[PDB]
Design a protein around this nucleic acid. Structure first.
Lengths: 167, 100, 82, 145, 63, 141, 103, 53, 143
RNA sequence: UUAAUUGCGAUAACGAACGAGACCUUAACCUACUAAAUAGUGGUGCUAGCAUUUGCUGGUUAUCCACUUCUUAGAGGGACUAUCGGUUUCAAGCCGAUGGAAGUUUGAGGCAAUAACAGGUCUGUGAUGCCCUUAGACGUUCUGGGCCGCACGCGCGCUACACUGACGGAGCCAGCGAGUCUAACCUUGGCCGAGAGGUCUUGGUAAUCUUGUGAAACUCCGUCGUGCUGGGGAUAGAGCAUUGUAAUUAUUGCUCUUCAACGAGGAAUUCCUAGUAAGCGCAAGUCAUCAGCUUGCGUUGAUUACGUCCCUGCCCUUUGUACACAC
């Protein structure tokens, strides 16, 4: 119907919109990632998340609302859009999930040093070859300071960075 | 009835294995066809300045998107095309079927 | 507002643009003995213009005195047949 | 390879259109050097007059100069498509007119003066001596004072 | 810059130490032996290793 | 079938595909005899393989070269390289390899680039300048 | 067509004769930039000969009725023969003088 | 009143706005993605616009 | 033997064919010639006032004879060029569509060409035969 | 020695990490492996022409075949200094002869360590610490303007200062790239015309169409010939219409005109080792309209260089120091 280039660009922008929505609200529900399954007359979207039992809602109401939002937005018949929720092993393999975890920890009021150290220790138990956490901004100070913690080896350049790392 | 199945994805390995298994299915189910016609990789180049503001050296970067396109013509029965649509479906590849 | 130049005048040469009989016969009697024939040499030796030089060359080659070797545009090389 | 001998009927100076003009050069460009007339116009009027282009303005006959000036001062006499004129649909008449050496400056004076007397923006710009085509005057074009 | 990196250095030393009999001076055979006795994730890196092994064997053939 | 050999000549962007086989002994380019490109110098430049090998030994062998891509110089260079390569292929597939080896030796002695394409490929232009290695300028005040 | 002898011979003779056989290089030293005379390689001899040749040709062809082709031909004829007026040799002898004197 | 928005916005950057930060200036319209340049820089990593050269 | 147009030297053949065409002189010339500059990007009229029309007609006939089907736009793109747009740089400018179309119509009337499917013109059989016959006549009367 | 704490090696160091290198895309070889009515190579009826005599061009799309040698995807293979000659505790390396594709990593890029600038950025945002409007507000909008204003100085730039020309007629070239679904883009066509202009669908969700992008300089024949002149195109005016309901402080495109400084430019400074400096252009970006700009690509395509620390910079070591926001 319309051009394939614009079609897949809209695919990308819709992916960005849904990722922004998920990371904006489902973050405190342990949201980690999404992948869109395209099927004739069906849009399956998968979600591997950490706090699945509390993102689910009592008898699938929140999942129903997430579904029916985009359903009514693109005049889908109910059931055509479907989102599935699973839990992945080794939750430390989710940079976004760890990001939102210590993000909430800051608004809770934990110490930055201890909190970041706990995050990096959780990751080291998860089994990362290298972990690196930088916190930048005001640290009981009126001048912006940037500080970092690291363990293991952390490659900084190359397609090994483009693929193997998580940021 | 004189349909065309085309694949316009950007996942190169998923496209490759999709084409491979579709070819294997067609050959093993004895449907005469010509090989998957392969189109030139369409590259989309979008050039953008790094700096949000107007400062810094006049540095540039070019974001690139790649598109691989394949198509195959099938003259195959209604029940068998229903079977092909409903099975051997592999995600990650945007595959669409038209007629003529 | 300032001219900002020297603009000294030229030599005001006597290059001949129109051709009369006293120049026709003059160039006819002066073109012999000249090993190399060209528009530039005609201009520099007869003080004649480009139009007159080309017109005279084509008239002479029509009459038949010297057989040319190349008629390439922007560069005409001629020699006398002796 | 035509050759025509010029007799004593040639004049070292020729006075046409109330201005001195130099002969000895091509007819078309002897017309171009006239004020208000240029390359294309001179060429097309020579074509209408049916004069040999290779010929120079010096070696022309009396009826040839007369037909040249006739086509210059009245194209409608020689069946010209009538839109070739230089100043058409003017203010004074509103129809197609033709301009010559004095005429260009006379009519320029007239219509610029109309602009000044109506105090139009273009006219006031011409009075000030500034750019009237909306050009950029901040940096470029300082050599006019 | 025909020098080789330290990873090529150590790969050559180690794999020659316990793979001397299987490879020889022949370049193509060295390539086709190292590729199969090694798990190299780069064709260019494999070519580097094979070239250094041939250089080492040329060194060994005398002295 | 007819014994016919298909080769090509290449330059910057000019591809010239040459078909050589048993014919009446004529060389035609883009449907035209090779005499009528009319650069008056590139004519002899594309004559060079023919003037070097001699046309006598190919009395009933004809070549049809069709050219595309690139400018005039690149096109005539692809023409000469193709009319050489097809000739060598014919001398290998249908005439003695004894003659083929010496013919390609003569081609190499005349010029290496007639059989081996120029490795001078286009160089991409980088941002920050009008040219591949040319930067815009550099002002101080 | 003029001087019907071998055209390649006369142009190679012009190149050989016009080749600057000795010139000089700038040397800083200290306090003042001075000049010191050296002899030059045949590569640079022939390159400078043809460079001066074509520079004089372009100068003599710039803004005149004379075409670049025949101005270059007459420049080669003068460079092969030697008439103290050609651009190429008139700068060759000038550079030789400013090298010998600087020496 | 019905003349609150009389002046048209059918062309120019009055119409073109970014789909992320509602930008009007710097809107790259190409391919119909309608986002500003810095938003494109930020979201290329996640959308799938990858830098190779 | 059979001699095709792509075998003969372009310039002298075209000139001889134009001279023969001019001597033939039964083409019903329009007359508005000697007014146009043959392009919108040109700045100066052509030189040969009394002619150049048989030149243009023979050129377009030869071009359409070698090609398969080209239109007025293709002819304008091919015959056009760049215009010196003042201090602005040069860009391609198309040739004169009115004269291109009118020579298209004149060649239609003399029957060398005909309308074609897909838009454009093809070469009529009589056009082929007469153009190539006059090519042979030029080859037989040039010496 | 290399471009490199690249390595060889020596050795109060041994063992590790990052950067570098590796890494990935682009261009360059295969006449070989799987595939191209979105095209041809090779054979026939429709074939027409040159023409009669034995060859070239194309169309004829359920009109009959093998393939990709020309538009292409892939375990693809291959330059690892491969072989050899010279110098080096002859170790790492460097200079030379070549089929082979290049033997400066075969090129050109992306990413790029640790620390820092108070370098840009609140003008990218329902992001903020601290001050400002809280109701004749700085909150959203309407009509005009303005950022284009010009005595002047500067900064990438385009055309130039003519004969390798200017102009005129004829012969041909590819590539990066874009293009209309609830809106109307790229425009293939008949036509009325000096040109710019004015119609209904046939073409297109795009190897099929726009687009052999028939582009520009470029090849052949022609006018002018050294006059600030047919060079240079700008400052004036007269007209013709798609843009915008709105050009006007010419928006723009064509025709006439105008014929202005400019005759290669002082001190002073930018890019450059191969298809690259440069000259020509083309596609996209911002596009209702407007490129002289930018991002890339393509055509024509050079002598220059294989060295240096002399000027300007970088790193390391040694060294002096009364410096330490650090000459």
């Amino acid at each position: 119907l319309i051009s394939k280039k614009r079609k897949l660009v809209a695919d990308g922008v819709f992916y960005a919109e849904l990722n922004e929505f998920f990371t904006r609200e489902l973050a405190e529900e342990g949201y980690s990632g999404v992948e869109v399954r395209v099927t004739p007359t069906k849009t399956e979207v998968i979600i591997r998340a950490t706090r699945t039992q509390d993102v689910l809602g009592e008898n699938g109401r929140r999942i129903n609302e997430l579904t029916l939002l985009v359903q009514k937005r693109f005049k889908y018949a109910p059931g055509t859009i479907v989102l599935y929720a699973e839990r992945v092993q080794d939750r430390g393999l989710s940079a976004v999930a760890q990001a939102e975890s210590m993000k909430f920890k800051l608004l809770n009021g934990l110490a930055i040093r201890r909190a970041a150290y706990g995050v990096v220790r959780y990751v080291m138990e998860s089994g990362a070859k290298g972990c690196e956490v930088v916190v930048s901004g005001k640290l009981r100070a009126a001048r912006a300071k940037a500080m970092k913690f690291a363990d293991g080896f952390l490659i900084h350049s190359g397609q090994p960075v483009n693929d193997f790392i998580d940021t | 009835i004189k349909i065309r199945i085309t694949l316009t994805s950007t996942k190169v390995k998923q496209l490759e294995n999709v084409s491979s298994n579709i070819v294997k299915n067609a050959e093993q189910h004895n449907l005469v066809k010509k090989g998957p016609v392969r189109l030139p990789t369409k590259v989309l180049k979008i050039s953008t300045r790094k700096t949000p503001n107007g400062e810094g050296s006049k540095t540039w970067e070019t974001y690139e998107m790649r598109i691989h396109k394949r198509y195959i013509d099938l003259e195959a029965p209604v029940q068998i095309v229903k079977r092909i649509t409903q099975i051997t479906i592999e995600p990650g590849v945007d595959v669409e079927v038209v007629v003529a | 507002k300032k001219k900002w130049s020297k603009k000294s005048m030229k030599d005001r040469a006597q290059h001949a643009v129109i051709l009369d009989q006293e120049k026709y016969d003059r160039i006819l009697k002066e073109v012999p003995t000249y090993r190399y024939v060209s528009v530039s040499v005609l201009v520099d030796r007869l003080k004649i213009g480009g139009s007159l030089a080309r017109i005279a060359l084509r008239h002479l080659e029509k009459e038949g005195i010297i057989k040319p070797i190349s008629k390439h545009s922007k560069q005409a090389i001629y020699t006398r047949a002796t | 390879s035509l050759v025509v001998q010029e007799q004593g009927s040639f004049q070292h100076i020729l006075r046409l259109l109330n201005t001195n003009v130099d002969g000895n050069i091509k007819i078309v460009y002897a017309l171009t050097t006239i004020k208000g007339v240029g390359r294309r116009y001179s060429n097309l009027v020579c074509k209408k007059a049916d004069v040999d282009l290779h010929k120079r303005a010096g070696e022309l006959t009396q009826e040839e100069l007369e037909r040249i000036v006739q086509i210059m001062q009245n194209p409608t006499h020689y069946k010209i498509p009538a839109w070739f004129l230089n100043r058409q649909n003017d203010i004074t008449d509103g129809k197609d007119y033709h301009t010559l050496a004095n005429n260009v400056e006379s009519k320029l004076r007239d219509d610029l003066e109309r602009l000044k007397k109506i105090r139009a923006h273009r006219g006031i710009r011409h009075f000030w001596g500034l750019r009237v085509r909306g050009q950029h005057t901040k940096t470029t074009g300082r050599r006019r004072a | 810059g025909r020098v080789r990196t330290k990873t090529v250095k150590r790969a050559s030393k180690a794999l020659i130490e316990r793979y001397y009999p299987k490879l020889t001076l022949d370049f193509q055979t060295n390539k086709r032996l190292c590729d199969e006795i090694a798990t190299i994730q780069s064709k260019r890196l494999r070519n580097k290793i094979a070239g250094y092994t041939t250089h080492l064997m040329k060194r060994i053939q005398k002295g | 079938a007819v014994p016919s050999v298909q080769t090509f000549g290449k330059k910057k962007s000019a591809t010239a595909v040459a078909h050589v086989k048993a014919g009446k002994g004529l060389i035609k380019v883009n449907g035209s005899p090779i005499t009528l490109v009319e650069p008056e110098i590139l004519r002899f430049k594309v004559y060079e393989p023919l003037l070097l090998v001699g046309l006598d030994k190919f009395s009933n062998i004809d070549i049809r070269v069709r050219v595309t891509g690139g400018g005039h110089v690149s096109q005539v260079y692809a023409i000469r390289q193709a009319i050489a390569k097809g000739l060598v292929a014919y001398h290998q597939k249908y005439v003695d390899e004894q003659s083929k080896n010496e013919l390609k030796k003569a081609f190499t002695s005349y010029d290496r680039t007639l059989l081996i394409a120029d490795s001078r490929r286009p160089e991409p232009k980088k941002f920050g300048g009008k040219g591949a290695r040319s930067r815009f300028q550099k002002s101080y005040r | 067509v003029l001087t019907d002898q071998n055209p390649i011979q006369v142009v190679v003779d012009a190149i050989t004769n016009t080749g600057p056989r000795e010139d000089t290089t700038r040397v800083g030293g200290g306090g003042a930039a001075r000049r010191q005379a050296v002899d030059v390689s045949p590569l640079r001899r022939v390159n400078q000969a043809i460079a001066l040749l074509t520079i004089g040709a372009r100068e003599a062809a710039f803004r005149n009725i004379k075409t670049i082709a025949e101005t270059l031909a007459e420049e080669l004829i003068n460079a092969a023969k030697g008439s103290s007026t050609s651009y190429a040799i008139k700068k060759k002898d000038e550079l030789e003088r400013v090298a010998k004197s600087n020496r | 009143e019905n003349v609150w928005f009389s002046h048209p916005r059918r062309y120019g950057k009055g119409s073109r706005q970014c789909r992320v930060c509602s930008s009007h200036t710097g809107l790259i319209r190409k391919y119909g993605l309608n986002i500003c340049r810095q938003c494109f820089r930020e979201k290329a990593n996640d959308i799938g616009f990858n830098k190779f050269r | 033997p059979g001699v095709s147009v792509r075998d003969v030297a372009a310039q002298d053949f075209i000139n001889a064919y134009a001279s023969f065409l001019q001597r033939q002189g039964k083409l019903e010339v329009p007359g508005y010639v000697d007014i146009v500059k043959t392009s919108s990007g040109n700045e100066m009229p052509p030189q040969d006032a009394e002619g150049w029309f048989y030149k243009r007609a023979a050129s377009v006939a030869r071009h359409i004879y070698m090609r398969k089907q080209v239109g007025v736009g293709k002819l304008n793109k091919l015959y056009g060029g760049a215009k010196s747009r003042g201090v602005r740089p040069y860009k391609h400018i198309d040739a004169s569509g009115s004269i291109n179309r009118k020579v298209l119509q004149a060649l239609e009337k003399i029957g060398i060409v005909e309308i074609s499917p897909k838009g454009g013109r093809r070469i009529s059989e009589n056009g082929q035969r007469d153009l190539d016959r006059i090519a042979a006549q030029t080859l037989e009367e040039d010496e």
